[PDB]
Every structure is written in structure tokens, then in C-alpha cells.
């Protein structure tokens, strides 16, 4: 069993530039984005998951049902759309983003007070780790 509900601050962000490059994000935006240390605010409500990734540049909000494919609008990220399914894999969330890019998806899990997020596309891997925090941030 796992519950992702909480507020989470970025601790480390490894290889994000190459991940965005593999999504063809242009270099001007990669410059802005690799400086960001976004927070995540997550509510897990049954199998209804809301993940709000919050930064000073752009936010990205996910709101989906685990196990249920949906049309994911990535306009503000890499100017694409995917048919995405996030599924349980034991206590991990395994996301497959079907679309133009091969091998696109991510895996999210918890280890103690760390939220782990591995993002993948075209064989390129970015790893982020967040720490659970308690001072709450108005947005
Ligand atoms: C050009 C550009 C690049 C990144 C981003 C953000 C970004 N940072 O990473 C990704 C890829 N994914 C959307 C992250 C996930 C959220 C939930 C599961 S995976 N976008 C920074 C914080 C949110 C948006 C916005 C815009």
C-alpha cells in the first residue's frame, strides 16, 4: 500500500536537459526549465490522482483515474498530445504516454519520505527525488 498525498519539494533533478532535448523542447525553454525546482502537491482520492507540479515558469496539472486511459495535453511542455495510462505496479505508478515519441512514460514511487520520479523518452532517462514537507504553500 502507498498514498502519495502530500506536498513535496525537489531535492535532486538528474539529466533533465537531455530529457527535454529528446522531447525537442527548444533550447531557450530548456534554459529556463532546468533552473526550476518545482514542488508537487498530490491528492490521492481512491484511484483518482491529482498531481500539481508547480514552478515559477509554468505549472503542469495532471488529474486522472489510475487504470483509465486518457488524452494527455502536453501543449505547455513539448507541444504534443498522448494517449496516457497510469497504472498501479505494486506500490508504484507506471505511466505510458502513447504518441509520437517511442518509449515515453514515467514511474513514480515512495521510499520513506522521498517521492521518486523517473521520466523516460526514446531511451533517455531523467530522475527526480522530492522530500515530503509540511509548511504549506498557498497558490
Ligand atoms: C518547456 C517546459 C519544460 C518543463 C516544464 C515542467 C516539467 N517538468 O517535467 C515535465 C515533464 N512532466 C510533465 C513532469 C511530470 C508531471 C507529473 C508526472 S511527470 N514538465 C516544469 C514543472 C512542471 C512543468 C514546463 C515547460
From Swiss-Prot:
Example of a GO MF term: retinal binding
Q: From the Swiss-Prot or TrEMBL record, state where the protein is found.
A: Cytoplasm; Lipid droplet
GO BP annotations of the record are: fatty acid transport; lipid homeostasis; retinoic acid biosynthetic process; vitamin A metabolic process
Q: Which UniProt keywords apply?
A: Cytoplasm, Lipid droplet, Methylation, Retinol-binding, Transport, Vitamin A
Residues recorded as binding all-trans-retinol, renumbered to this chain, are 40, 62, 108
Q: Where is this region: Important for interaction with STRA6?
A: 21-31
- Identify the tissues in which this protein is expressed: Detected in nearly all the tissues with higher expression in adult ovary, pancreas, pituitary gland and adrenal gland, and fetal liver.
Pfam families listed in its UniProt record: Lipocalin
Membership in a protein family:
Belongs to the calycin superfamily. Fatty-acid binding protein (FABP) family.
Comment text on domains: Forms a beta-barrel structure that accommodates hydrophobic ligands in its interior.
Q: How does it assemble?
A: Interacts (only as retinol-free apoprotein) with STRA6.
Describe the task this protein carries out: Cytoplasmic retinol-binding protein. Accepts retinol from the transport protein STRA6, and thereby contributes to retinol uptake, storage and retinoid homeostasis.
Entry-linked PANTHER family: FATTY ACID BINDING PROTEIN
Official protein name in the record: Retinol-binding protein 1
Q: List the source organism.
A: Homo sapiens (Human)
Gene expressing this chain: RBP1
Amino acid at each position: 500500500p502507498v498514498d502519495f498525498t502530500g506536498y513535496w519539494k525537489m531535492l535532486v533533478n538528474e539529466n533533465f536537459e537531455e530529457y527535454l532535448r529528446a522531447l525537442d523542447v527548444n533550447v531557450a525553454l530548456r534554459k529556463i526549465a532546468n533552473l526550476l525546482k518545482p514542488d508537487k502537491e498530490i491528492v490521492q482520492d481512491g484511484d483518482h490522482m491529482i498531481i500539481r507540479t508547480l514552478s515559477t515558469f509554468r505549472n503542469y496539472i495532471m488529474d486522472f483515474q489510475v487504470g483509465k486511459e486518457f488524452e494527455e495535453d502536453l501543449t505547455g511542455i513539448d507541444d504534443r498530445k498522448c494517449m496516457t495510462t497510469v497504472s498501479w505496479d505494486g506500490d508504484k505508478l507506471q505511466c505510458v504516454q502513447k504518441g509520437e515519441k517511442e518509449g515515453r512514460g514515467w514511474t513514480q514511487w515512495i521510499e520513506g519520505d522521498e517521492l521518486h520520479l523517473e521520466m523516460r523518452v526514446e531511451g533517455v532517462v531523467c530522475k527526480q527525488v522530492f522530500k515530503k514537507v509540511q509548511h504549506h504553500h498557498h497558490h
